[PDB]
Amino acid sequence: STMIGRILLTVVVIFRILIVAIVGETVYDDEQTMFVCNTLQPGCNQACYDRAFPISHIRYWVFQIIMVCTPSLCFITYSVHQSAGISRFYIIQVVFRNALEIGFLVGQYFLYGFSVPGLYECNRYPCIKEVECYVSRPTEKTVFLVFMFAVSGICVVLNLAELNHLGWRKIKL
Amino acid sequence: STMIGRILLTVVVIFRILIVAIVGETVYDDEQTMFVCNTLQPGCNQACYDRAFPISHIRYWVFQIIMVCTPSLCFITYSVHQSAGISRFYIIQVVFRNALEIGFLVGQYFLYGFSVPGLYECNRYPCIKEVECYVSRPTEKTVFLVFMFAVSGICVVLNLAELNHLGWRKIKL
Amino acid sequence: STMIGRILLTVVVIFRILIVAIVGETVYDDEQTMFVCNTLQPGCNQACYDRAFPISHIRYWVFQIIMVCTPSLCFITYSVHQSAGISRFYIIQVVFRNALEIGFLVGQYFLYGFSVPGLYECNRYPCIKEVECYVSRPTEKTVFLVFMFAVSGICVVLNLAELNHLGWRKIKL
Amino acid sequence: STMIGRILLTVVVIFRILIVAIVGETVYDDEQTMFVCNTLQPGCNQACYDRAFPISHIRYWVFQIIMVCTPSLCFITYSVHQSAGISRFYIIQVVFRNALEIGFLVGQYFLYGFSVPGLYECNRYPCIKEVECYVSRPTEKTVFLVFMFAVSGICVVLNLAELNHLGWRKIKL
Amino acid sequence: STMIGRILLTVVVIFRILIVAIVGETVYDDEQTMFVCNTLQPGCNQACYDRAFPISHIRYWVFQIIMVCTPSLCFITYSVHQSAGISRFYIIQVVFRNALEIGFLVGQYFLYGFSVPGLYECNRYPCIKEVECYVSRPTEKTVFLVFMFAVSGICVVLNLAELNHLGWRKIKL
Amino acid sequence: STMIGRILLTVVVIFRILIVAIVGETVYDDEQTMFVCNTLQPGCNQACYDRAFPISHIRYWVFQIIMVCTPSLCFITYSVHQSAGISRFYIIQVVFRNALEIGFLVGQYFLYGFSVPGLYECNRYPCIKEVECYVSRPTEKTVFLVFMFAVSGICVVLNLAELNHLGWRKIKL
């Protein structure tokens, strides 16, 4: 069942890349232009949006995708250069991909949670005391967040299955 | 008629992909900017738009297209990996494509219906009690929705015809 | 004269595709942003624009182009599948392309006419009784409409010439 | 000197295509948004802009470029179809290119003149009597218009030289 | 040092093309939208911007790049036509490239100077007498202008070195 | 360990290029539109933004990437020209790339520091005395700046390792 595992992993990676590159940019285009705070203080919108969304979801997902693909690029470069042994490099890159995927999943959970609330309570300068701000299309962003989390979890499960197939004794050496 | 069925299925899939990728993004570009609610409450436009359109039609159709194409990608990857038995994989991927197409059709019907009304009655916080909001180019979006439903139905019919051609006794094994 | 007819048909199809894909999107970009109605009623602009232009000319032309190209795609896919009788398929696709072109020409005439008036009289809710709206760059859109109609007419004439060359006794059989 | 003439003609055609496709779209992007009329009448801006610029320069130049390239496409398609006499087709396409280029140059002169005035005097409904409107970046558009006229004139001269090289008694037959 | 000279010239040309195509468009995107004049007179912003920046730097640089590359295109086309003596054409195109680069450098100096002031004093109709206008991101544009001047100067020096290597007694013949 | 060093250097360079080209443009899109100063003075926003961000981070990073890749382009062009000794050119380009990377890292540190403050105190004409301005999404820009600094540091370390592998006595000769 290793071959089906590799096929599924490749398919899921391509699926995630396509979904991000196609829709993520459009979904988060007006994230700040349509972010409005109930206030008259100049600069409160900027500060409140920055506090609410320190890093946009799309940027985080793009960075995650590139980082997770990086070990594959390392392996491909090594293979290309070798021609004008590789099993150890393959095992190492599998381990690194596992670690990177797990770390990115955990970071996404700890940074964004599982939903984007429609209201934000912002109490940052220059806003006077505490103000209420309203997010743009929170439901679509929540769906995107949950779907990306599910896809990353599937990738993590497939990578863990591949690692188990490789076996502990074989990564120890 | 299996060959003409496959030809028609491929043609319809390419047609749907082209139509989406070419016009869908432009049609739904100003969905939120031109969405206006008869109110003075800050943040009511965002909440009302989010309630009216939890997921944009274009995003749902893009996701549907990628998901429906996924089994073909799995089959192609399996074929590539095999070279440096496949009939069972072909039957399985045909079944999965049929199921995915039917599911996406049903989901589209249950999520969007058959028309996009020009008026929306929004009663979500912070809007005071009940307010009236006005949708951008509802007729074009209704035409797009109906056309996509028809194309998906044609795809479902072709997939069912292919499944019937394969026969129950072959998919059972 | 069949060969020159085919060459002219191909050239005209390519020319129409190029013109649309290059200038239509830019011409019809600010169709709604620059559409203004003389009124204070919120949501009257959206309703009046939707009534005036149920389907943008550019979307209709893109759909027409893809649909009229569809029979050629069907023929190409059939030819590819055959290699690892075709005259009948060629005749059938010629007939279908002729019918599609004629239908799209008639639909364009019945749906848009021959000009885009600079003034529109809109009496749709929520607009109070009757209001006057002003279209964006009506002259350029009128020129585009007339030019597209002329190109479609040339395509129809070429298709009819090809059909006449083929002969009724051969389409019947 | 026919070889150098053909080389110069090809280079000039490519140069014009590159210049248009690279800068023309950006130069005319804000043609309507930055067009302002000294009035309070709703819809007067749209009418005055439409009267001042019935067809954008960029659209006209794109149409001209495609049309002048069309005879070359016809020749290439004829050559492709011939393989699985051509001198007459070459002469005919050269004559047609000459006629098209001359006609487009004359049309540009009669439609746009040689400069884009910074002020426009607009007396079209709904504008109250006569109003003054101000064009966006008129100097850049004037420079672009003059440069395009010069390039088209160079193309016309080269095509006329090629025709003279071919000779009257040879086009006649 | 003719080989290293040619390599450096090619690298510098590619570098300039890349820098322009990548950043120049973005740098000058909001040149007019962010250009503001201290006045209430309608149309004063357009007139003052047109006077301050008759031709955008990016358009001038694009035109310069294409024109400077034109002799190379002529040489390549001549070489292609020759196959189904060239030293003279090479010398001629070297001379023409040198002349074009020098002319464009001189024109840039005489047209834009070496800096973009943050304030512009505009006294063109309809502005009343004399008004003050404020330029968008003048420092970035000044840096871009100086950098482009330096790159063009390097290109001019390399071309002059190549010409000196060729020798006057060889260009004369 | 030279081999893993080269592979890592190539992978990191590709990673930086991808990250910039994919997200940097979008992160810094509304840098000036969302820049707001607490004042009524016309033209104060432009001056304050220009003072706060003389050169956008994205432009600096693009310039750095192209300049750092330039030595590789020189080496490739030299290799191509030689075919229809190279070790010295390889060593020279390695030294130049190391120097360029170090210089760009130092320049980035001196020009931008390590964070983008959310508040800016601007006292440039025409702003009256001293005004407060609010930056757009400062946290995301700070994260991007720190990440780019880390990547550049990794590149510098790898280049220094390669230089040490080559040794002093080889670069000296």
Author numbering:
A (entry chain I), B (entry chain H), C (entry chain G), D (entry chain F), E (entry chain K), F (entry chain J): 19 to 102, 194 to 282
Study text:
Connexins (Cxs) assemble as hexameric hemichannels (HCs) that reach the cellular surface and dock with their counterparts on the neighboring cells, forming the gap junction channels (GJCs) and coupling cells metabolically and electrically. Pancreatic Cx36 plays a crucial role in insulin secretion, whereas in the brain Cx36 is involved in neuronal synchronization. Three antimalarial drugs, mefloquine, quinine, and quinidine, specifically inhibit the Cx36 channel.
Cx36 with and without the drugs (1 mM) was analyzed by cryo-EM, yielding four reconstructions: Cx36–mefloquine (Cx36–mfq), Cx36–quinine (Cx36–quin), Cx36–quinidine (Cx36–quid) and apo-Cx36, at 2.14 Å, 2.73 Å, 2.9 Å, and 2.49 Å resolution, respectively. The overall protein conformations are nearly identical, similar to the recently published Cx36 structure. It is possible that in the detergent environment, the NTH is too dynamic to be captured by cryo-EM.
